Amino acid sequence: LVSGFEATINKFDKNFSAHLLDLLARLSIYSGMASVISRLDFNGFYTERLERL
């Protein structure tokens, strides 16, 4: 639960973080208005960390 678990989990985590960043980024260009992204990540981390324009 620490070693093979970590190996299976981290590829899921990489894919989920990828699949989360591109959605919040592709919604952040569209401008509630920008409240949709703003509520989904209240922290503002993975909200758009790979800014576009």
Binding site: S35, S38, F42
Partner: protein, 420 residues
């Protein structure tokens, strides 16, 4: 689904008595259980549809040196709940050993009510930490419940033992009970006795009947927390959904209590949100940061109000954040209950996972460390000696609570790929 509520000890039977009386007044039932004509609801969460047209709650009645439980006996709310399972102190070791020798038939009592309901969601324990009567027996029964049924939830409504207090074995008892709470529970709801005492001596000018008024507070909080289960919503009509967001990991499962009116004896969502976020409308009184907050509101709520209120809460930043992730205050809306008094028409409560409770834990640990270093405050209790002649359980509990404090401080960090 359905919740079976367990009450034990004099303080635990006191808070269960006031909670059952509160839900009796709340729902459309007499103290006998006679149906009313005004009752989107549910009456099958704490109540069995029982077999004399009284919605008899599934409650386990446990007594240990009964004084106030006798007063519970000759009462009009003894016609509401009595499935006739009453079966017989000032120490954790005494209550633990007494619970140990008779675990069989009280487990049969648990089995009877477990067979009683069709479905089950969790076990809510009316418990008092280092209350003497509740202590020891509560920790032992917690071990019995979590070992015997690994598929259900265990909830423990707990007080923090500071009542401006004589008992000097109380840090040892609270430390052993806290070891059981960290290891044998899925979630723990903790309150401070001193915080509720300060709030009660604030809102009124009462000094002597503090116990009964604190009972009113915890019963109102317990009704408010399960309103979303008792009244059908969209989420947290099961316990595990409300339990899920606040608890990020099996070690941090201790939840702060908030409720934005301290009053029941005009208003909007926006004002009660900003009124909730202060630590002096919290009923539990370096960098200290919440892991996750969840608030549930009940009233005549305009749906745009929660939206712009959460806007204001964001750009003001009046809540303490989580470094390692997003886990924030979540707006939940619930139905206003029938036959509740019409003050604070928009009323909300919050449950939150905060690292500030680590301070209270290490304070009690410091008290234990002081009395343990002095070695004059074990008092040589005979059950404490016979239970453990080497007293290594105190060392194990100290290690577990130290790991707990370290994991708290590690969750405080921006890295929680560093553990404890």
């Amino acid at each position: 689904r359905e919740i079976i509520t367990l009450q034990l000890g004099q303080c635990g039977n006191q808070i269960g008595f006031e909670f059952w009386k509160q839900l009796c007044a709340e729902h459309g039932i007499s103290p006998e259980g006679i149906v009313e004509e005004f009752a989107t609801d549910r009456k099958d969460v704490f109540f069995y549809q029982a077999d004399d047209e009284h919605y008899i709650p599934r409650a386990v009645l446990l007594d240990l040196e009964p004084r106030v439980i006798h007063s519970i006996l000759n009462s009009p709310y003894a016609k509401l709940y009595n499935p006739e399972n009453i079966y017989l102190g000032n120490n954790w070791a005494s209550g633990f050993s007494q619970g140990e020798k008779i675990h069989e038939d009280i487990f049969d009592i648990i089995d009877r009510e477990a067979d009683g309901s069709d479905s089950l969601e969790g076990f809510v324990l009316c418990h008092s930490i280092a209350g003497g009567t509740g202590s020891g027996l509560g920790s032992y029964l917690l071990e019995r419940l979590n070992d015997r049924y690994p598929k259900k939830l265990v909830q423990t409504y707990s007080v923090f033992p500071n009542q401006d207090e004589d008992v000097v074995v109380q840090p040892y008892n609270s430390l052993l009970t806290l070891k059981r709470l960290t290891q044998n529970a899925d979630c723990v709801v903790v309150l401070d006795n001193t915080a509720l005492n300060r709030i009660a001596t604030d809102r009124l000018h009462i000094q002597n009947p503090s116990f009964s008024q604190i009972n009113q507070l915890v019963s109102t909080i317990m009704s408010a927390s399960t309103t979303t289960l008792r009244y059908p919503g969209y989420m947290n009509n099961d316990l595990i959904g409300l339990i899920a967001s606040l608890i990020p990991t099996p070690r941090l499962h201790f939840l702060m209590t908030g409720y934005t009116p301290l009053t029941t004896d005009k208003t909007t969502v926006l004002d009660v949100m900003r009124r909730l976020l202060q630590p002096k409308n919290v009923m539990v009184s370096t960098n200290h940061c919440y892991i996750a907050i969840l608030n549930i509101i009940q009233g005549e709520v305009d749906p745009t109000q929660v939206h712009k209120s959460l806007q204001r809460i964001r750009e003001r930043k009046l809540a303490n954040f989580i470094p390692w992730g997003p886990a924030s205050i979540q707006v939940a809306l619930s139905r206003k209950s029938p036959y509740l008094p019409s003050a604070h028409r928009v009323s909300g409560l919050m449950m939150a996972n905060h690292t500030s409770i680590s301070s209270l834990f290490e304070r009690t640990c410091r008290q234990y460390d002081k009395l343990r270093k002095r070695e004059a405050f074990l008092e040589q209790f005979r059950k404490e000696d016979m239970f453990k002649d080497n007293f290594d359980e105190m060392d194990t509990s100290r290690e577990i609570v130290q790991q707990l404090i370290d994991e708290y401080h590690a969750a405080t960090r921006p890295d929680y790929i560093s553990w404890g």
